[model samples]
Target: SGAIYVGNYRVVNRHLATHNDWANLVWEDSSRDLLVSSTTAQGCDTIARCDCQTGVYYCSSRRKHYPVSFSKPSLIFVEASEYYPARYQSHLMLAVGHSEPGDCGGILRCQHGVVGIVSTGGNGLVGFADVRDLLWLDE
Candidate 1:
C-alpha cells in the first residue's frame, strides 16, 4: 500500500516543494481542512484544532481560526547519506529527534507556533522545512 497516514487519517493531497525541500499532506477529511505548516508563516500562534466528530488535527488560531508566533531565521545543515543523497539546508533546527520513519511529516512547533515540518533526523538533531518557505502553499 502506497497510502500515507498521519495519526490514522489518510493523506489526500501530498504537496511537495522539492526546491525548498518541504512537503505537506492534506487529509481525506474536509472538516480538518486547516494546513498546519502554512499557518506559522503569517505570524500567528498555532494550536491543535481537534474535530470532535472526526478526531482529526487542524492548525489554526484566534485571528483566522489559528494563532501563531514569529521567529528570526536560522540555519542548519543535513549531510548527504546513503538514504538521502542530496544535502539539505534548513531554516530551523531542533534537538529533539525521531525514528521508525513515521515522524517525518510531523509538525515542528515553537511556543505553540508552527515553525516547520519534520523532514529528516539523526545524530540527536531533527531538520524541518521553515514556515517561511511554506507560505506559498497557503495559496
Candidate 2:
C-alpha cells in the first residue's frame, strides 16, 4: 500500500505548481484519486474522497468498460452479508449487468469492450439502478 497522500490545497503566500495527480491520463478520464493540494496560512477545509484513488491516474472502475477496452463495470450497492461483518464498514452490494453485444458496434452497434456513463433518461435508463428512491429524482 505504498501510497502517497497530500493535503487538498497548498500555498506559499504566492506559489503555484501543476497538481500532477491526474497526470498520464486521457481527457476527462479522472481516477478516483482526490490528491488535492491545499496549504493555506489559515482556515478549515474539506474535500471529496472515496475508498479508491489518491493523487494518481486510475481509470474510473465504473467507466473502464464503457470505452470498449476493459472489463465491464459491475454496478453494485455497497452492503455486507450476515455471514460477514455487521458493521457498515464491512458491507457491499452489487448488481450485475450483461456485457454489451459485440455486433452492436457504431450507430447503436456495440463491439467488444464498450461502456458509457449511466444515462438517466435514455432508452437504457430503465436498467440503471441506485439505492435512492424515486422521490429524489426531483433533485
Candidate 3:
C-alpha cells in the first residue's frame, strides 16, 4: 500500500501507526530518532502511548476503552443479555437501571431517531456497558 496517514494516525503497509508492533515501532523510532506524539481515545478519557525509544504501549482496544460520556454519572448494576425469543439477534435488553426500581421505571419511549427509558430517581449510583447493548431490566 502507498504511504498515507490513516484516521489522523500515520501508517505503513495499510496498518495503523497504532497497529504496528510495539517492539518494531520502538526499534524503528529508536533507529530513526522519531518522536511520536501521545494519543487519546475518543468519547473517553483513556490515554494511549508507547515509548518507541525504550518501552511499552497502552493502546486499549476500542470496546474496552471506557467512553468519556459514561463518566458523567451512574445509577447501579448496568447489566445486559440477549433478548431471546428473539428476532434481531444484535439487539439487546440493556438494564440502564438503579440499585432499586425507585430509580428507572418502564421500557424505553421513542419518536424519530431517539429512544430512552424513563428515569425515576432523578439522581444516582451504578455502572455501565456497550452501545448495541440495551438496558436489561427487572419485571
Candidate 4:
C-alpha cells in the first residue's frame, strides 16, 4: 500500500499484487505424487526432483517440485540468466519484456517466486530489482 523497504531502498507491494491477482505467492496444494504419480514422464521427473528437495511428497507426481528457481511470473530464472543474486528482490523488472519493474504485482524474471521491495521511483516503488531481504511465502 505504501513504501516498504527490503534493505536501504523503499518499495511497494500492492502495486505488484494489483497486476498479478495471485499476489506474490501461490499456495501449493497437490503433492509430488499427484503431479508425477500418473506414470507421466514430465510428472515422473517433476516428482523425483520434488522428492529430492523436500525429502517427501504429498501423493505421487503432485507438484512436489515447487517453482522456486524461476522469475516471479516468467519461466526464466533470474539468478541463472539475469546475472543477479538469488537472495532478495534484485530488480522489480529484469529488463525482460514484462512491464514497469517497481509497480505492485509487476511481473519480472525473479529468481524465486517472491518479490521484495528494493527501491522506489515516484508514486510507487522504483528500481526494485534489489531483492536482498525478501522472504519466500506460500500464499
Candidate 5:
C-alpha cells in the first residue's frame, strides 16, 4: 500500500480503491450507521459511558473499552463482563479471528459488528476483551 502520514490523522499516497475500500468497510451492508449513537444500552442499562479524555473505558488484560486509535480491518460489539466499570454502559466492541477477509464478517465475542483494517501481531488478531460501537439496520 505504501502509506505515509506527516500530520495528525493525515494520509498520503493512498490508493483510491484502498480509500473507498476502508471508508465503506465498516458498513458492508451496515455502514450507514456510523458515528456513536446517543441512545445506547449496556446489558439492558439505558445508558453507558467512556471518558476518552481520561484514557479509561473498561481497562483489562492489554485491551479495554477506549477508542481505537488506528486503522483496523474489522470491528464488532460484544458482551461486557461483570469486570467492566460502572459508568460504561455498553462495552464498545471490535472483532478479529481466523475468518477470511470481508466486510462486517469478523466475529468476536459481542453480538454486533464493524469493518475496517485488521488489528494483529506476529500471529494474527490480538484479542477481544473490550467494549463497543453499534449500528441500526431498518428492515
Candidate 6:
C-alpha cells in the first residue's frame, strides 16, 4: 500500500448506507474536482423512468486509489430483477461487460447525469445505489 496521502484533500466524512449498499465520501475541499464531472441524478431521471437502452452510459472506479479505471467503454442499463432478487428499491443495475471487486464505489454516468454509485456486481451485471438520496444529504 502507499502512504495515506493521495492528494491535497482527504476524506472528511463518510456516509455509508448499508441498507442500500452504497456510500458517499466527503472531501475536505468541497470545491475540488470530482472523479466524474456531472450533476447528480434527479428523482425524475431515475433508470425506471427512462429507457435504459436509449442512451450510452459509463462507469468509473479507482482501483486501490490509483488512476481511475473505466468499465468497458459503454454500458446498457439492465433490470436488476433479471439478475438478482429484490433487495433494495433504489438499486440501479447496468450491463457491464466484465466485473471486478474493486469496481465498488465507481461512478455511473449518462448524458442525463450521474446515475448512481457502483455497489455490487456479478454475472456481467453491476448494481449501483441511486444518487438522489445521497444528494439530498449533501444539500
lDDT of each: 0.34, 0.20, 0.21, 0.24, 0.24, 0.35
State in Å the error of residue 100, model 1. Answer: 4.4
Q: lDDT by residue for model 1 over 7-65, one digit each (tens)?
A: 32222112222322224333211111123322222432343222111111122211111
Task: Give model 4's TM-score versus the native structure.
Answer: 0.20
Error of 5 at 59 (Å): 25
Off by over 4 Å in 2: 1-63, 66-85, 88-93, 96-129, 132-134
CA error at residue 30 for candidate 5, angstroms: 21
**The CA-based lDDT of model 1 is what?**
0.34
How well does candidate 1 score on lDDT at residue 73?
37
Cα distance off (Å), candidate 1, residue 29: 27
Instruction: State model 4's lDDT.
Output: 0.24
Off by over 4 Å in 3: 1-68, 71-100, 106-123, 126-139
Model 3 weakest lDDT span, ten residues long: 130-139
lDDT of 4 by residue, 1-139 (tens): 2232222222334223333323322321111000001111221101011111111111112222222222231122222113223333323322211123323222222333223322223332223332322232110
Ordering by TM-score: 1, 6, 4, 5, 2, 3
Over 64-100, each residue of candidate 5 has an lDDT whose tens digit, in order, gives 3434332222343323323222232122233232321
TM-scores, all candidates, are: 0.39, 0.16, 0.15, 0.20, 0.19, 0.37
Model 4: which ten-residue window has the lowest total lDDT? 29-38
Candidate 3 lDDT for residue 100:
32
RMSD, every candidate, angstroms: 13.0, 16.6, 20.1, 17.2, 16.7, 12.2
